[PDB]
């Protein structure tokens, strides 16, 4: 991302929202507006594409946002546009307007240090409203997250040091999200989420193995039935743990507590945890989401929004309501549990969460 002016009288356009007076606007048009001597318009809908699983349509992800930032800064830095207001626009559907609005908000949060109430004021009570974001599963939608949720989640993640666009590697991000290179994303400095490898090694499996070996993965957690031989991870010195539960279900809290204990053990030793389910989205979202809430105090909606900003489609169907209804439990564990000092066979000799009582006995 090239350097640009660090973010004049107002201009007034229909179907346009003012973000920065005289300089940054958000439009929605079903035609191509012509540039004037006072205005320059641009859209990324012809170049930046959300790849839907089913009926999910957004939000746009961190790689989309990074590419938007490059395109935006090139327009802002053009001497031709020195005394023009820049109008970022989308087509007029409520879904594409939601994507463009949320992506401009995430830009201002991550690149220009705006705060949530600053980026949300321009969008509040817009008529027609933006389409709320739905999950990626195949059932009828019954849980929505909003731009407010995504903005707060992305902002909180940035504040906690989980997002850093200065070190973000777009080419690595884009490569490894491909099915043929392993379908994974580095979610945070501590966590990778990935689709299960498959072994009848194929190219996606070797990509995962080499990336994991070179990027300090010290624990692989398997949440779905066996599609590969775990010996290949052990061959490169990475511990492998099963915490399997049924596709499309929510984990018993005992599973979540064991996962959080396992992850804490690995993090305190300075390693990453790579978690997979079949798709690396649903069951994986339940467990990593719980740990993020436990660690950083996200709301459930923020957590879902942040997770999908890095890896679209995480937390599927009823798992959304499950995360929502248990977010207090995950947060409460910081005060009601401790990392045990006895290893546990249930998590491969790592240290599980135990109550304050059993900790006093130890």
């Amino acid at each position: 991302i090239p350097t640009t002016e660090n973010l004049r009288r107002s201009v007034y356009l229909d179907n346009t929202i003012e973000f920065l007076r005289g300089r940054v606007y958000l439009g929605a048009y079903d035609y191509t507006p012509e540039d004037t001597d006072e205005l320059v318009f641009f859209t990324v809908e012809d170049a930046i594409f959300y790849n839907s699983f089913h009926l999910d349509f957004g939000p746009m992800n961190i790689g989309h946002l990074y590419r938007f930032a490059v395109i935006f800064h090139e327009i802002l830095n053009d001497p031709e546009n020195a005394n023009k207001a820049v109008v970022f626009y989308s087509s007029a559907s409520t879904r594409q307007r939601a994507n463009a609005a949320c992506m401009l908000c995430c830009y201002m949060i991550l690149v220009q240090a705006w705060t949530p109430h600053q980026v949300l004021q321009p969008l509040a009570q817009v008529d027609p409203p933006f389409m709320p974001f739905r999950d990626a599963g195949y059932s009828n939608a019954d849980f929505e997250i909003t731009i407010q949720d995504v903005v707060y989640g992305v902002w909180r993640a940035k504040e906690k040091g989980l997002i850093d666009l200065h070190s973000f590697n777009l080419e690595s991000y884009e490569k490894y999200e491909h099915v043929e290179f392993g379908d994974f994303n580095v979610l945070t400095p501590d966590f990778i989420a990935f689709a299960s490898p498959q072994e009848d090694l194929n190219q996606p499996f070797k990509s995962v193995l080499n990336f994991f070996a070179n990027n300090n993965v010290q624990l692989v957690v398997r949440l779905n039935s066996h599609l590969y031989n775990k010996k290949h991870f052990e061959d490169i010195g990475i511990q492998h743990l099963d915490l399997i539960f049924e596709d499309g279900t929510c984990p018993d809290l005992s599973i979540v507590k064991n996962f959080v204990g396992a992850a804490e053990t690995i993090i305190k030793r300075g390693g990453k945890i790579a978690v997979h389910s079949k798709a690396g989205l649903g069951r994986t979202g339940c467990l990593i989401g719980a740990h993020l809430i436990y660690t950083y105090g996200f709301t459930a909606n923020e957590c879902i929004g942040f997770l999908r900003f890095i890896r679209p489609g995480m937390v599927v169907g009823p798992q959304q309501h499950w995360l929502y209804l248990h977010q207090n439990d995950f947060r409460e564990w910081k005060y009601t549990t401790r990392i045990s000092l006895k290893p546990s066979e249930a998590i491969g000799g790592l240290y599980p969460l135990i109550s304050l009582e059993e900790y006093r006995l130890q």
Binding site: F53, G137, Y138, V179, D247, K278, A279, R283, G313, G317
Partner: peptide
């Protein structure tokens, strides 16, 4: 159709 969706 209740499971995780397929990337493709």
């Amino acid at each position: 159709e209740l499971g995780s969706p397929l990337k493709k």
